[PDB]
Amino acid sequence: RFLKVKNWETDVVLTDTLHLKSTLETGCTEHICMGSIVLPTKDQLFPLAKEFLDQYYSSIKRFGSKAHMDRLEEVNKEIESTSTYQLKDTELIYGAKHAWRNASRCVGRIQWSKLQVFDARDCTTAHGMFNYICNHVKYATNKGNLRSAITIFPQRTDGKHDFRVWNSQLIRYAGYKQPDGSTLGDPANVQFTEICIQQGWKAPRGRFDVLPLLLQANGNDPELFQIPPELVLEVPIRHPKFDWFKDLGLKWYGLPAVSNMLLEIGGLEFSACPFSGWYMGTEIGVRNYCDNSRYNILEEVAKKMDLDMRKTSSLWKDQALVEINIAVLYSFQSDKVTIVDHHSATESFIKHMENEYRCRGGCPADWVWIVPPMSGSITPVFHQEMLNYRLTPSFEYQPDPWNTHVW
Amino acid sequence: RFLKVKNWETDVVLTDTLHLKSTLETGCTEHICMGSIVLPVRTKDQLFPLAKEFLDQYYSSIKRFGSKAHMDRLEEVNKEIESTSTYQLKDTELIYGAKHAWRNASRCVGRIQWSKLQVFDARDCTTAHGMFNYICNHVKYATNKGNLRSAITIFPQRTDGKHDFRVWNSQLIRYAGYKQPDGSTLGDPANVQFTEICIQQGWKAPRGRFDVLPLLLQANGNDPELFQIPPELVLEVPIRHPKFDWFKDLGLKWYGLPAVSNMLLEIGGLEFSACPFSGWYMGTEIGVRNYCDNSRYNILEEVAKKMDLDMRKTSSLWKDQALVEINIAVLYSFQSDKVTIVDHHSATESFIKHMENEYRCRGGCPADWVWIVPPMSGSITPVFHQEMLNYRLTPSFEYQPDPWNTHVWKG
Ligand code: HEM
Ligand code: HEM
Ligand SMILES: Cc1cc(N)nc(C[C@@H]2CNC[C@@H]2OCCNCCc2cccc(F)c2)c1
Ligand SMILES: Cc1cc(N)nc(C[C@@H]2CNC[C@@H]2OCCNCCc2cccc(F)c2)c1
Ligand SMILES: C[C@H](O)[C@H](O)[C@H]1CNc2nc(N)[nH]c(=O)c2N1
Ligand SMILES: C[C@H](O)[C@H](O)[C@H]1CNc2nc(N)[nH]c(=O)c2N1
Ligand SMILES: [Zn+2]
Known part of the structure; x- marks a missing residue:
């Protein structure tokens, strides 16, 4: 009991x-x-x-x-x-x-x-949804002082009159498969990025293309909308000591805004x-940048720090991962955008x-x-027993609507 | 199903x-x-x-x-x-x-x-002494001069369950930890209690940061008795770093043979x-946990000091930086001495x-x-992304309470 x-x-x-x-x-x-x-x-x-x-x-x-x-x-x-x-x-x-x-x-x-x-x-249309969302984005962002x-x-x-935001986050970057064979931008959003273009999105076809919103009101076919660019606060990524770091052309957005639940x-x-709310540094630095299924930039970063990549035992992935994350934290902080580090969180x-x-x-x-995807045991939560159980009221994952809806 | x-x-x-x-x-x-x-009792x-x-x-x-x-x-x-x-x-x-x-x-x-x-x-073992010797041979064979088996x-x-064979050590080879009258421990803090128990049975403790505790061995439900692993049997690796020459001056070493004895x-x-x-160690067991847990050697503060990291805000990730260097050092030291070890990527x-x-x-x-999943760099190891089912199959290794909590003393 x-x-x-x-x-x-x-x-x-x-x-x-x-x-x-x-x-x-x-x-x-x-x-x-x-x-x-x-x-x-x-x-x-x-x-x-x-x-x-x-x-x-x-x-x-x-x-x-x-x-x-x-x-x-x-x-x-x-x-x-x-x-x-x-x-x-x-x-x-x-x-x-x-x-x-x-x-x-x-x-x-x-x-x-x-x-x-x-x-x-009181919302009734996708335009209405777009308006409520832009207001959400601006209020939440607060010029960098996120709330x-x-x-x-x-x-x-x-159940046939569902309102849905198709994007998984209000703000995310596009992904395109290339005749090359590799992937440009975020390969997490490849499918969604095609779906947008398949609905008349002129994609600038770059690495950090902020995606358009697909709003579904009252179970209707969904529609595209571009968040006013001035509402999407983004951070250029630099290192407090590695001058060459900016030459990777890394940027991330300030507002994590989960919209598929x-x-x-x-x-x-x-x-x-x-x-x-606001980011824990590791979500971007460890997962978004370093996952193999994601921006996967460890390979290229270690190559600039002049690390020995010849054997796994040099811990070069590990060295580079730290620096990458130091840089995210420093970049956000330099720009007075709320971010929290995993120790502090x-x-x-x-x-x-x-x-x-x-x-x-x-x-x-x-x-x-x-437990953060880096330095687990040096964070206090690693040592903490936790019990897991489902209480209500709750957020619950729902599947991508494109798997669901008809036109 | x-x-x-x-x-x-x-x-x-x-x-x-x-x-x-x-x-x-x-x-x-x-x-x-x-x-x-x-x-x-079954x-x-x-x-x-x-x-x-x-x-x-x-x-x-x-x-x-x-x-x-x-x-x-x-x-x-x-x-x-x-x-x-x-x-x-x-x-x-x-x-x-x-x-x-x-x-x-x-x-x-x-x-x-x-x-x-x-x-x-x-x-066929029947006494503690019988146990010492079986274990000595275990440790010699397993070590194999650094090529662990x-x-x-x-x-x-x-x-x-009145006549149990027990090894009171949780590992066959493990360092002492001695609580000082000021709250600092000298030595590995995980072994304070066992250390005192040994001290109580008349082990004379060198009292340093790295004393190899004695085996405490119980045969046939009898009280247990002390024994020194012969030191020439105990393979140890002093810890140094490939690029940091001051690392050796921290005076650290670890034993080569991880040998779980309490299950x-x-x-x-x-x-x-x-x-x-x-078996043999994955490097993080020593580099992350043994050295860097707050409840263990806790060398983070000391290592980051020496590296001149910015220690005034956790957001410099100084703690994360020092952790990696320590882990590089452990794997470096072991490979250099030809003592088997595996890193967390490979493992x-x-x-x-x-x-x-x-x-x-x-x-x-x-x-x-x-x-x-390793206790550093979780997501850049492939196990992190792996869904797993956990369930209990026999034969099996089970945890059991430390025996001083159970053993009834004959004296
Ligand atoms: C204020 C700063 C916040 C921080 C630092 C934070 C932190 C996090 C992190 C690190 C995760 C897992 C991240 C991942 O790997 O996907 C997460 C998941 C989640 N958080 Fe937060 N959170 C914050 C605010 C919020 C807010 C405002 C809500 C809702 C009101 C929320 C609800 C959730 C839910 C439901 C999940 C699970 C998501 C899933 O299953 O994909 N959090 N949170
Ligand atoms: C080949 C060398 C081995 C490696 C690199 C290895 C790796 C590990 C690691 C890292 C742990 C957890 C460490 C900790 O946090 O305590 C562990 C746990 C364990 N291993 Fe191994 N292992 C090895 C060999 C063995 C062998 C030979 C056995 C038994 C024949 C074994 C049985 C177990 C058991 C029962 C646990 C759980 C311990 C506990 O619950 O306290 N392993 N292994
Ligand atoms: C399949 C699946 C199930 C599930 N429950 N969830 C997902 C989202 C993935 C998983 N893990 C990373 C990614 O989600 C992306 C990061 N999510 C942000 C969480 C967050 C942080 C700060 C403030 C916030 F409001 C929200 C996928
Ligand atoms: C309370 C409790 C339960 C349990 N199952 N286990 C423990 C030992 C903890 C686990 N983590 C720290 C300490 O265990 C330290 C010893 N673990 C070595 C595992 C190992 C590695 C390589 C080769 C081997 F043969 C064995 C405590
Ligand atoms: C509370 C938590 O279960 C506990 O601290 C665990 C977490 N994972 C672990 N994982 C390993 N390999 N060894 C450990 O000692 C622990 N400790
Ligand atoms: C399979 C495994 O459950 C999966 O990779 C999990 C592990 N822990 C995680 N933890 C967080 N915070 N976010 C994640 O996306 C995941 N992914
Ligand atoms: Zn469970």
Whole structure:
């Protein structure tokens, strides 16, 4: 029932009681652990609504009050007659902040309660979506002093009227396969980049082409839109000591803004719900630049540091990886754009765990995702036992709509 | 029912059917994953099925499943069990047994090596002194003057669990750590408690940053007794850096032979509570963990100082810079002295070919992602991008409590 988590660096032991209020399934059984797998009705809706509203009213310390009780009735009546219901603004804001609070894969949740919510449930068209998004981008960016935000489009209905942002992030770079055989730009977005061009995007066909947005309103065929270039804050990448570094022509964008997820609040499904905070340095320096499936630039970088690339045991990949990441951090900082390093992020996430443990009775955390893709054991989270479980409200991965929609 | 794992870098999808032969539990449920938790006397009743399972396995793999030879051995073990309540493994079974425990060790990146394991059978051992000598020979053979070879020594199985063979050291070779009256430890901090226990049994401690602790050995459930590994048997590598000449002046060395002595080898239901095993190091075990954990030698501060890194903001990645140099030094030192070591790139790459081969020939390979991915440079090693299934197969190595917590003293 009660379960302990031990930190093996500090010996601090925490007791998790929050898991018993756990809802969905993990993918694991008594027989098999799936911790490292990336993807493991009126009757159905009311329990979900009730469960959500009970946590809301308890959170505002009016559990069992008439204000509480009255609301449970109204939602039930609306379900029985309308087949869905609408969240109050208070509920929407609480629902959103908690979906982030419950995201077991996010190292940055110390911040969870500072989420600016933009209610875009009155949106009806893709142009409308584009407007709400540009406003999201500008508010969030704040000329480099980034602030967390999420924008919530209308909730699923019969499911054929879904609002969706097709891009996986508001801001990402194109990818083109070349007659050469290699790939120009980001090969993560190759498919999506063709889909855009296959819908009349004049792609400048470069390495760092900011992609156009594909907005789907009300289950309609989606449309292209170019984020005002002045709204996309980008950072040229230089090193505090390697002068030649800029000659690689590396740039990255300041705003990570995840837009392919599904927000579930009290049984309601918000299928377009882009949110954004700010980067941990390693997301760009380690993953975006150094993954083989990505910009994959280690080979070329080590070659400029004059490192011995003849044997893996010289650790040249490792030397170059550090420098690449020093440079990302330095570049963003020089330009006063919010970024956080993995030491500082993970340190803040331990403080946030301890808070969640005494304050909430626990904190679902996915260790595989929380530990940075560099220097794991020199970050405090490496030594921290974490329990992983699915609470609601939540964000959930949804598959690329192009796999789904018809025209 | 088949399960698939994806490699997110290569898009290679594998199909695991071996998880179907798993019986033991994981600590996980449909409602909780305990994937990151470190730790999540047997009756005749339960024993024969475990024997039977095991021997069905052995005979399958030698291609004798169903043979008169297989049925005879089942019957013979059967009888032996109800007559004497336990049973003895044949040699061929013991060897098969201990290879498979390593094979099934899901937290072990070194398994491409599994079929090459030198089993020493120490099941005629009866005293601690007997234990010392078996172990000395283990260490000599395994070392092989720096050209390390994998080995395990198996002392007698548990009986009533009142007569256990134990090695009190968690590794056969490990440095002392001595807590000072001011809170600083002198030496490796992981071994403070064991160090004191040794000191208590009358070991006279040199008290330096690198003293090789004595073996504490328990035979037949008896109290244990001290013993010095002969120093000429203990291969050590002083740590220097290829370009940094001041690195040697930090006075660091490490031992060559990693030899886990605190685990339990279960084969066909039998429990071998002393089965020290040894292989060779992946460099990061020393360079990242042993040296750079805060709870270990903690040399980061000292190394980065000497390198003149900017130490006033963590965002200089000074800590990350110093970590790499230390790891370069470890691999450099070991190669220079011709002591076997493998780097984390080479090791994870081998594990991937191993894993892939293990799906092809065995229908799977249990693997614990959290332990397999190295504790530095995770994503630039290919295991990071590897989906893994973790499950428990027997034979197996199990953790067991430190015995001073359990052992009842005779005095
Ligand atoms: C404020 C700074 C933030 C930091 C530093 C941060 C950090 C991260 C990181 C490092 C990851 C995994 C990254 C990856 O490799 O893909 C992640 C995942 C995630 N984060 Fe955050 N986060 C922040 C803000 C937010 C916000 C505002 C939300 C939503 C309100 C959020 C929700 C999520 C979710 C749902 C995931 C899992 C994504 C997936 O499955 O692909 N985070 N976070
Ligand atoms: C060929 C040399 C080997 C290499 C490079 C290697 C690699 C490793 C590493 C790096 C670990 C985890 C290290 C740690 O953090 O404690 C490990 C764990 C383990 N290995 Fe190996 N291994 C090797 C040989 C062996 C052998 C010969 C056996 C048994 C015959 C074995 C069985 C195990 C077991 C049971 C664990 C888990 C230990 C625990 O849970 O504390 N390995 N392996
Ligand atoms: C297949 C699949 C499943 C899943 N759940 N997720 C993905 C996105 C991939 C995975 N891992 C990297 C990449 O996502 C790209 C990075 N995501 C940014 C997370 C972040 C950081 C700071 C602030 C934020 F608002 C958000 C793919
Ligand atoms: C509590 C607990 C449970 C468990 N299963 N294990 C431990 C040992 C920890 C793991 N990490 C630090 C320390 O183990 C240090 C010893 N690990 C060497 C593994 C190895 C490498 C190469 C060849 C070999 F034969 C063996 C503690
Ligand atoms: C297969 C494995 O689960 C996969 O590569 C994971 C590992 N940990 C991760 N961790 C984070 N933060 N982001 C990721 O994309 C991944 N990928
Ligand atoms: C809490 C966490 O499970 C623990 O610190 C683990 C993580 N992964 C590890 N991986 C290896 N190889 N060795 C370890 O000691 C650990 N420690
Ligand atoms: Zn699990």
